C-alpha cells in the first residue's frame, strides 16, 4: 500500500500513524528521526598560519658594486647600500670608503609547526541534508538513511520511501568560513592573492606544503647599523595571531537549533528545524485482514487522572468487550494529544490503562482502538515543576489551550442587541405608517 | 597619479586613453585584453561508464536445500530453485527429483575500459573571472593578470590596478554538467544514490576505482532452462550508451560569445561580453613635464579621404607648427571614432597622415595633438565589401549614424504653427474687445 505524511524535524521523537483499509486492520506505523546530517558543498581556497621570515647571509662586494635583483619568493625584497665597513671577530673583513657595497634580501615561508597549527579558508554553498530514520510497521523494523531531496529514495529492504523537500532551509554556515584545529569560525576572509599587512590571511598557499606561496606584510629593509654586520629588518605582526586573539567565539556555541558540527565532513548533525513530507510504500503482506484481527464491543473511555505536563503525564483507562483474542493498535485521531504505547494484549471483556501527553490542558478528543473509536473529555492541570529539558511540545500549540469555561463565558458575553435594533426599526416603521393614518 | 576608466569585454582590442595634468604632457595609455579566463567553482558528484555484469559459478546443492542470502555488491541479487537436473559433458552431475536445489546470484562492476571511457557528473556554481591585460604607458609595457573582483589587484611591477566588478554576469555553465573525454555536456543528472534502469547514471562511484559502488538496472533472474546448467539473466541496457547516442551536441558549439572551453580547469577562455571598470595608479616618474614636451602652433585638420568601414579605413591629415622637437601623443576625444597610432616624430612645421576608424559615416569630432586640439568634419561612405570577421564595431553605435543632411531636413520640417495659433488667439481677443466697443 501507499501513504504520505508530514513530520517535523526533530530527533528521537516517535510519531505514531495509521493506514486505513477496509477489510484490513489499520496498521500502526512508528516513525523516528534517529539522527540528522546536513552536509553542504565545500571548496578549498587557501591555507594560512604563522610565518617565519628569512634573513639569508648577505651579499657583500668588497670594493665593487652590486644591484637589486628579482626573485619569485613570497614577499621577496632586496636593497643595497655602499660605503660600508663591516667588522667581525677576526677584525674588519674589508673596507673601501665608497667601493664597498652591501646587498640584503628578505622573504618568508610557513613555519615548521604550521603543519599542525594551520587554518584554512573555505567557500561553502548549497546546503544538503542527509537523514537517518527508523520505521516500524507491524513489528517490522527498518533502519534507513536518505537525502531529503524528493528524487532519491534511500534503500532499506528495497523499500523506496521518498521525503522532502525541506519546508524551510536553515544554514548556520556563511558562504565563507575558516577551519582550525577542529573548530569552525564564521568569517569573511579575503580573496586568494588579496592580502593586507597585519590582517588575517597575510600568507596563502594552495597546499600546506605547496612550493608556491604569496603574501604581503610591509617588509621594508633598514640601513646597516654601526660597524657590525647584520640585517636590520622590519615587518608587521602576523594576522594569524591577531585574529586568534580576536577571532570571536566558535560557531559551536552560536548555531541555532543546537547544531552539532564536525570538521572533516564540514557538516552539522542533530540540528532540528522545519517539517518534511514523506511518501511510504508498504507491502500488502504486512497488512492483516480484518476478520483475522479481533473485534471489539461497547468500549468506554474513562480518565483516571491527567495533569497537563511535558512527559507522558496524562493517564487514561479503557473498558472493552471483544469476541476474539490477539492484538490491536491504538491511536489519538486528535493531534493535540499523543499516546505513548502502540498496542497491547486484548481480552473478551478486559480493561487497560494508557499513557499519553498533550499540548493543551483540555483533554477533549477521540481515540481509536482496533477499528472502532470512542470519545474522551476531561480537564488536566498545569504541573508544579516548570523546567525540564526532556522531550516536550511533541505537538505544537493550536490556540486550543482556551478552556471550555472560557468559551462558555465568551459565548454568553457577546451581545446581540442588533436584533433588538432591527425589531425597533420594524416597530418604528409600523408606528410611522399608523401615524400616517392620522 | 591615479585614474579610472571602463572598458568593454573583448580580446585583442587596444584602447587608447589620456591622463591630463597641468604642467605635464598627457601620457597615452594603451590597454589590451590579451585573454580572458572564466573559472567557476566545481564539485565532483560521481562517475559513470559502461558496466559489465557478473555471473559467478552457481551454488548447487546436490539433494539438499539452500537459501537467498544478502551481500553489499551493487545490484546484488539472488534466487533459488529446486528439483533441477543439471547436466555436463561427463554426464549428469546430480539428480534428485525434489532435493536438488540451485542458487544463482548476480551483480555488476565498471568495465575495465571504463578507466578511459568514464564520464563524470559535476556540480558547478559561482562563476569567477580571471583576465590577462597588457598595459603600455609612455613606452612602458606591463603584462598583468588579475581577477575582476574589486578587491584584489594583480601584481605586475608591484603596480596595483583594480578592476570590476563585471557589468553583467554571463555563464554558459548550468549548475549541473557532465564531462567525458575532454568534452563538456550541459545536462541535469540525477542525485547520488538516485538511479533509474535504462537511464543515464545508472552506476555511480565516488572514484573511478572506488570499491564502493551502487546501481539499479532492473536485474531479475530467470528460471533454469532445459537440462543444461547455466544462468539465464535479464537486465536493461546501459544508460551510458543510450545517452551517448542522444547526448546532444557539445556545449563547445552552443555557448554564446564564442567561448573556448577546456576541461581540466573546467573553464572558459576568450569569451567576451559586458564592461569592466578599472582603477589605475601610475608613478609620477613616468610623467613628463610639459616644458620638456614640445609645443605646437596653428595646427590644421585636413581629411584626405575616408570611407566608412570596419578596419582603419578612415584617413586624416594634419599640418602643424612647432617650436621644439620630440614626440607627442594623439587622441580622439570623441568616442565615435578611434585612431590607430599613438604618437609620431614631430617637426617645426611638418605634417603627418593618420589612420582611424569610426562607428558612423559622419566624421565630425575633435582630435588632440600634444595638449592642443583641432576639429575635423567630413563625410565617409559605406564600403562595398560587407562581410569580414576581423575586429569591427570597436565602438558601439550611439544613434549618431544620422547624417547632417537628415538633421537639416528634420529641423526645417517640424512645424511651428502653434505660434500662428497664439497670434490668432491674441488678435481674436483684441477684435473681441473692439466688437465689445460696439
Ligand atoms: C508481528 O505481529 C504478528 C501479528 O500481529 C505476528 O504474527 C508476528 O509473529 C509478529 N512478528 C514479530 C517479529 O513479532
Ligand atoms: C620612452 O620615451 C621617452 C621620451 O618620451 C624616452 O626618453 C625613453 O627613452 C623612451 N623609452 C623607451 C624604452 O623607448
3-state DSSP of chain B: CEEEEEEECCCCCCEEEEEEECCEEEEEEEEEEEEEEEEEEEEEEEEECCEEEECCCCEEECCCCCCCCCCCCCCCEEEEEECCCCEECCEECCCCCCCCEEEEEEEEEECCCHHHHCEEEEEEEEEEEEEEEEEEECCCEEEEEEECCCCCCECCCCCCEEECCCCCCCCCCCCEEEEECCEEEECCCCCCCCCCCCCCCCEECCCCCCCCCEECCCCCCCCCCCCCCCCCCCCCCCHHHHHHHCCCCCHHHCCHHHCEEECCCCEEECCCCCEEEEEEECCCCCCCECCCCCCEEEEEEEEEEEECCCCCCEEEEEEEEECCCCEEEEEECCCCEEECCCEEECCCCCEEEEEEEECCCECCEEEEECCEEEEECCECECCCCCCCCCCCCCCCCCCCCCCHHHHHHHHHHCCCHHHHHHHHHHHHHHHHHHHHHC
Task: State how beta strands A314-322 and A296-306 pair.
Answer: antiparallel
Cβ-Cβ contacts under 8 Å for B302 (sequence gap 6 or more): B316, B317, B318, B319
Quote the cell numbers at residue B243: 545517452
Please tell me the distance from the alpha carbon of residue A412 to that of residue B404, in angstroms, as a whole number.
88
| Angle, alpha carbons A6-A8-A13 (nearest 5°) | 110
Please tell me the distance from the alpha carbon of residue A394 to that of residue B297, in angstroms, as a whole number.
92
B87 exposure class (CB count in 10 Å sphere: 0-12, 13-18, 19+): middle
Contacts 24+ apart (CB under 8 A), A260-265: A261/A172, A261/A184, A263/A179, A263/A182, A263/A183, A263/A184, A265/A39
B41–A123 C-beta distance less than 8 A: yes
The alpha carbon of residue A268 is apart from the nearest alpha carbon of chain B, in Å, by: 19
In order of B103, B106, B234, B354, the CA distances from B55 in angstroms are 12, 6, 11, 80
- Does B265 reach chain A within 8 Å, measured CB to CB? no
- In this structure, are residues A26 and A371 in contact, taking their beta carbons and an 8 Å threshold? yes
| Angle, alpha carbons A105-A110-A116 (nearest 5°) | 165
A433 by DSSP, 3-state: which? helix
Please tell me the distance from the alpha carbon of residue A33 to that of residue A135, in angstroms, as a whole number.
9
Is the CB of B377 inside a 6 Å radius of any atom of ligand 2?
no
- Does B70 reach chain A within 8 Å, measured CB to CB? no
**Cα dihedral across residues A317, A321, A326, A331: positive or negative:** negative
Among B368, B435, B362, CA closest to B403: B362
E strands along A333-430, which residues?
A: 337-339, 343-345, 351-358, 365-369, 372-376
The alpha carbon of residue A345 is apart from the nearest alpha carbon of chain B, in Å, by: 34
Q: Which residue has the cell 559605406?
A: B382
Q: Which residue has the cell 512508528?
A: A30
According to DSSP, the residues that pair with B61 across neighbouring strands are: B101
- Does A191 reach chain B within 8 Å, measured CB to CB? yes
**Cα dihedral across residues B164, B168, B171, B172: positive or negative:** negative
Please tell me the distance from the alpha carbon of residue A180 to that of residue A47, in angstroms, as a whole number.
10
- Does B71 reach chain A within 8 Å, measured CB to CB? no
Please tell me the distance from the alpha carbon of residue A56 to that of residue A74, in angstroms, as a whole number.
14
* Burial profile B154-189: b = 16 or more Cβ within 10 angstroms, e = fewer: bebeebbbbbbebeeebebbeebbbbbeeebbbbeb
- Does A125 reach chain B within 8 Å, measured CB to CB? yes
Q: Indicate the helix (H) or strand (E) that contains A336.
A: none
Please tell me the distance from the alpha carbon of residue A51 to that of residue A301, in angstroms, as a whole number.
76
- Does B126 reach chain A within 8 Å, measured CB to CB? yes
Is the CB of A342 inside a 6 Å radius of any atom of ligand 1?
no
Report how far ligand 2's centroid is from the alpha carbon of B139 (Å).
6
Q: Report how many helices (DSSP H) and strands (DSSP E) chain A contains, helices first.
A: 4, 27
B125–A126 C-beta distance less than 8 A: yes
Q: Indicate the helix (H) or strand (E) that contains A408.
A: helix A404-413
Alpha carbons within 13 angstroms on the beta-carbon side of residue B412 total 5
| Angle, alpha carbons B126-B129-B133 (nearest 5°) | 175
Q: Which residue from A minimizes the CA distance to B155? A: A193
A357 by DSSP, 3-state: which? strand
Among A108, A121, A243, A124, CA closest to A191: A121
B123–A126 C-beta distance less than 8 A: yes
Please tell me the distance from the alpha carbon of residue A217 to that of residue A223, in angstroms, as a whole number.
19
- Does A123 reach chain B within 8 Å, measured CB to CB? yes
Q: Indicate the helix (H) or strand (E) that contains A437.
A: helix A417-437
φ/ψ of A4, rounded to 5, equals -145, 155
In order of A81, A287, B101, B217, the CA distances from B85 in angstroms are 100, 38, 9, 30
Is the CB of B342 inside a 6 Å radius of any atom of ligand 2?
no
Is the CB of B140 inside a 6 Å radius of any atom of ligand 2?
no
Is the CB of A327 inside a 6 Å radius of any atom of ligand 1?
yes
Please tell me the distance from the alpha carbon of residue B362 to that of residue B393, in angstroms, as a whole number.
15
User: Which atom in ligand 1 lies closest to the alpha carbon of residue A139?
Assistant: 1
Quote the cell numbers at residue B137: 604607458
Q: Which residue has the cell 599613438?
A: B342
Cβ-Cβ contacts under 8 Å for B428 (sequence gap 6 or more): none
3-state SS string for B189-200? CCCCCCCCCCCC
Please tell me the distance from the alpha carbon of residue A199 to that of residue A23, in angstroms, as a whole number.
73
Report how far ligand 1's centroid is from the alpha carbon of A298 (Å).
27
Among B339, B332, B307, B302, CA closest to B319: B302
Q: CB count, 10 Å around CB of B227?
A: 10
In order of A76, A77, A107, A219, the CA distances from A72 in angstroms are 7, 10, 10, 15
A44 by DSSP, 3-state: which? strand
A193–B154 C-beta distance less than 8 A: yes
Per the document, the length of chain B is 438
Q: Indicate the helix (H) or strand (E) that contains A6.
A: strand A2-8
* Burial profile A67-103: b = 16 or more Cβ within 10 angstroms, e = fewer: eeeeeebbbebbebeeebebeeeeeeeeeeeeebbbb
Among A18, A29, A30, A23, CA closest to A373: A18
DSSP state of A430: H
DSSP state of A412: H
- Does B191 reach chain A within 8 Å, measured CB to CB? yes
Is the CB of A139 inside a 6 Å radius of any atom of ligand 1?
yes
- In this structure, are residues A6 and A80 in contact, taking their beta carbons and an 8 Å threshold? no
Please tell me the distance from the alpha carbon of residue B180 to that of residue B185, in angstroms, as a whole number.
8
Report how far ligand 2's centroid is from the alpha carbon of B140 (Å).
8
At what resolution in Å was this solved? 4.3
Please tell me the distance from the alpha carbon of residue A230 to that of residue A17, in angstroms, as a whole number.
82
- Chain B residues inside the 8 Å CB shell of A147: 191, 193
- Does B147 reach chain A within 8 Å, measured CB to CB? yes
Please tell me the distance from the alpha carbon of residue B81 to that of residue B22, in angstroms, as a whole number.
100
Report how far ligand 1's centroid is from the alpha carbon of A369 (Å).
18
**Cα dihedral across residues B183, B186, B192, B196: positive or negative:** negative
- Ligand 1 atom 1 nearest Cα: A139
User: Which atom in ligand 1 lies closest to the alpha carbon of residue A140?
Assistant: 13
User: Which atom in ligand 2 lies closest to the alpha carbon of residue B140?
Assistant: 13
The alpha carbon of residue A401 is apart from the nearest alpha carbon of chain B, in Å, by: 44
Q: Which residue from A minimizes the CA distance to B42? A: A43
Q: Which residue from A minimizes the CA distance to B190? A: A151
- Does B6 reach chain A within 8 Å, measured CB to CB? no
According to DSSP, the residues that pair with B357 across neighbouring strands are: B338
- Chain A residues inside the 8 Å CB shell of B41: 43, 123, 125
Is the CB of B139 inside a 6 Å radius of any atom of ligand 2?
yes
Strand order in the sheet with A337-339: A296-306, A314-322, A351-358, A337-339
Residue of B139, B324, B327 with the most ligand 2 atoms within 8 Å of its CB, for mutation:
B139
Cβ-Cβ contacts under 8 Å for A330 (sequence gap 6 or more): A28, A339, A341, A342, A343, A344, A354, A367, A368, A369
- In this structure, are residues A430 and A371 in contact, taking their beta carbons and an 8 Å threshold? no
A118 by DSSP, 3-state: which? coil
Q: Which residue from B minimizes the CA distance to A45? A: B41
- Chain B residues inside the 8 Å CB shell of A152: 190-194
- Ligand 1 atom 8 nearest Cα: A139
Given A147, A152, A191, which is nearest B147 (Cβ)?
Answer: A191
B125–A152 C-beta distance less than 8 A: no
- In this structure, are residues B408 and B393 in contact, taking their beta carbons and an 8 Å threshold? no
Amino acid at each position: 500500500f501507499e501513504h504520505a505524511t508530514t513530520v517535523p524535524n526533530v530527533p528521537g521523537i516517535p510519531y505514531k500513524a495509521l493506514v486505513e483499509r477496509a477489510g484490513y486492520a489499520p496498521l500502526n506505523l512508528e516513525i523516528t528521526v534517529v539522527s540528522s546530517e546536513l552536509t553542504p558543498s565545500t571548496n578549498k581556497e587557501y591555507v594560512t598560519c604563522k610565518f617565519h621570515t628569512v634573513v639569508p647571509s648577505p651579499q657583500v662586494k668588497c670594493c665593487g658594486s652590486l644591484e637589486c635583483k628579482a626573485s619569485s619568493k613570497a614577499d621577496y625584497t632586496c636593497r643595497v647600500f655602499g660605503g660600508v665597513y663591516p667588522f667581525m671577530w677576526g677584525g674588519a673583513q674589508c673596507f673601501c670608503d665608497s667601493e664597498n657595497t652591501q646587498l640584503s634580501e628578505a622573504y618568508v615561508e610557513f613555519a615548521p609547526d604550521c603543519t599542525i597549527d594551520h587554518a584554512v579558508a573555505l567557500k561553502v554553498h548549497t546546503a544538503a541534508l542527509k537523514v537517518g530514520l527508523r520505521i516500524v510497521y507491524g513489528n517490522t523494523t527498518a533502519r534507513l538513511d536518505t537525502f531529503v531531496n524528493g528524487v532519491t529514495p534511500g534503500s532499506s529492504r528495497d523499500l523506496k520511501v521518498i521525503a522532502g523537500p525541506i519546508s524551510a532551509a536553515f544554514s548556520p554556515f556563511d558562504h565563507k568560513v575558516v577551519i582550525r584545529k577542529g573548530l569552525v569560525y564564521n568569517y569573511d576572509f579575503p580573496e586568494y592573492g588579496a592580502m593586507n599587512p597585519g590582517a588575517f590571511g597575510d600568507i596563502q598557499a594552495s597546499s600546506l606544503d605547496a612550493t608556491d606561496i604569496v603574501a604581503r606584510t610591509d617588509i621594508r629593509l633598514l640601513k646597516p647599523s654601526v660597524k657590525n654586520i647584520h640585517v636590520p629588518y622590519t615587518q608587521a605582526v602576523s594576522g594569524y595571531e591577531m585574529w586568534k586573539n580576536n577571532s570571536g567565539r566558535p560557531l559551536q556555541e552560536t548555531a541555532p537549533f543546537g547544531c552539532k558540527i564536525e570538521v572533516e565532513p564540514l557538516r552539522a548533525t542533530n540540528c532540528a528545524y522545519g517539517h518534511i513530507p514523506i511518501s511510504i510504500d508498504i507491502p500488502d503482506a504486512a497488512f492483516v485482514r480484518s476478520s483475522e484481527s479481533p473485534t471489539i464491543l461497547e468500549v468506554s473511555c474513562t480518565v483516571a487522572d491527567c495533569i497537563y505536563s511535558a512527559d507522558f503525564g496524562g493517564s487514561l483507562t479503557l473498558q472493552y468487550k471483544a469476541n476474539r483474542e490477539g492484538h490491536c493498535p491504538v491511536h489519538s485521531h486528535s493531534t493535540t494529544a499523543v499516546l505513548k504505547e502502540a498496542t497491547t494484549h486484548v481480552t473478551a471483556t478486559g480493561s487497560i490503562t494508557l499513557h499519553f501527553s498533550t499540548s493543551s490542558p483540555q483533554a477533549n478528543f477521540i481515540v481509536s482502538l482496533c477499528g472502532k473509536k470512542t470519545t474522551c473529555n476531561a480537564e488536566c492541570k498545569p504541573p508544579a515543576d516548570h523546567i525540564i529539558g526532556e522531550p516536550h511540545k511533541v505537538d505544537q500549540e493550536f490556540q486550543a489551550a482556551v478552556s471550555k469555561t472560557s468559551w462558555n463565558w465568551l459565548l454568553a458575553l457577546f451581545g446581540g442587541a442588533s436584533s433588538l435594533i432591527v425589531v425597533g426599526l420594524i416597530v418604528l416603521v409600523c408606528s410611522s405608517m399608523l401615524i400616517n393614518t392620522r
